Short mmCIF file of C-alpha atoms in Angstrom, two decimals:
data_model
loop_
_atom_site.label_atom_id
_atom_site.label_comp_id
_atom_site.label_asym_id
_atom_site.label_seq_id
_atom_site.Cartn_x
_atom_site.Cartn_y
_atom_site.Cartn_z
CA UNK A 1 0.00 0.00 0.00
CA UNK A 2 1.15 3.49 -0.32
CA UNK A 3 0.66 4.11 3.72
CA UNK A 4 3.18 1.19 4.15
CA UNK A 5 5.88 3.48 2.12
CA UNK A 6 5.02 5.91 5.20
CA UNK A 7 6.06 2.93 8.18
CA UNK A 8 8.57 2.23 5.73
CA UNK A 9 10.56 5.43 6.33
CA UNK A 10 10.01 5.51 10.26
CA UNK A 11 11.18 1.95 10.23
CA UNK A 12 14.63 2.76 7.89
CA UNK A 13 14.87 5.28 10.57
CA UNK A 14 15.30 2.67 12.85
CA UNK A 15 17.97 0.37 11.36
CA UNK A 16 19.69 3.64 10.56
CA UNK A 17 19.56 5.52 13.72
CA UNK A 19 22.47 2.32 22.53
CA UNK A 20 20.03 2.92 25.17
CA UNK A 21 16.55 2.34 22.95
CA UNK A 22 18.68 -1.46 22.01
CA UNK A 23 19.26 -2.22 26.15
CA UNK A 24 15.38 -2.01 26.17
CA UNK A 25 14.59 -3.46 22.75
CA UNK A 26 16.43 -6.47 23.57
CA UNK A 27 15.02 -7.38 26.86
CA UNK A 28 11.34 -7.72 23.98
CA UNK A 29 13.37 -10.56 22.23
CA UNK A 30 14.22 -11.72 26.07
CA UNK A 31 10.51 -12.37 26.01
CA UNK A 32 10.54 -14.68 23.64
CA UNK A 33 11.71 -17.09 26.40
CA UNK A 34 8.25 -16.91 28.18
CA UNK A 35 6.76 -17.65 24.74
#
């Protein structure tokens, strides 16, 4: 869709541009509970 062009940009952002990561990895950490 052209609205998915929009998430697409916010989500480059992402891979592109520490802290945020400390935090973000504890969500894959959740996997374990599953």
């Amino acid at each position: 869709g052209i609205g998915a062009l929009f998430l697409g940009f916010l989500g480059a952002a992402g891979s592109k541009k520490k802290n945020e990561q400390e935090l973000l990895e504890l969500d894959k950490w959740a996997s374990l509970w599953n």
